[PDB]
Amino acid sequence: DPCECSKSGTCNCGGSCTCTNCSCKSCK
């Protein structure tokens, strides 16, 4: 299962990360 980021289509890691198995440079 992909991360809500790639799943949903619109990442939302602006501020704090909550989702699991992430891989964004805006959080990581």
Instruction: Write out the residues near Cd ion by the rule CB under 5 A.
Output: 3, 5, 11, 13, 17, 19, 22, 24, 27
Tell me the C-alpha to C-alpha distance, in Å, between residue 11 and each of 5, 20, 23.
4, 12, 10
Identify which of residues 9 and 17 has a Cβ nearer to Cd ion in the complex: 17
Identify which of residues 1 and 27 has a Cβ nearer to Cd ion in the complex: 27
User: Least distance from C-beta 17 to Cd ion, angstroms?
Assistant: 4
4 assigned ligand-binding residue: no
Structure tokens at 7: 């799943």
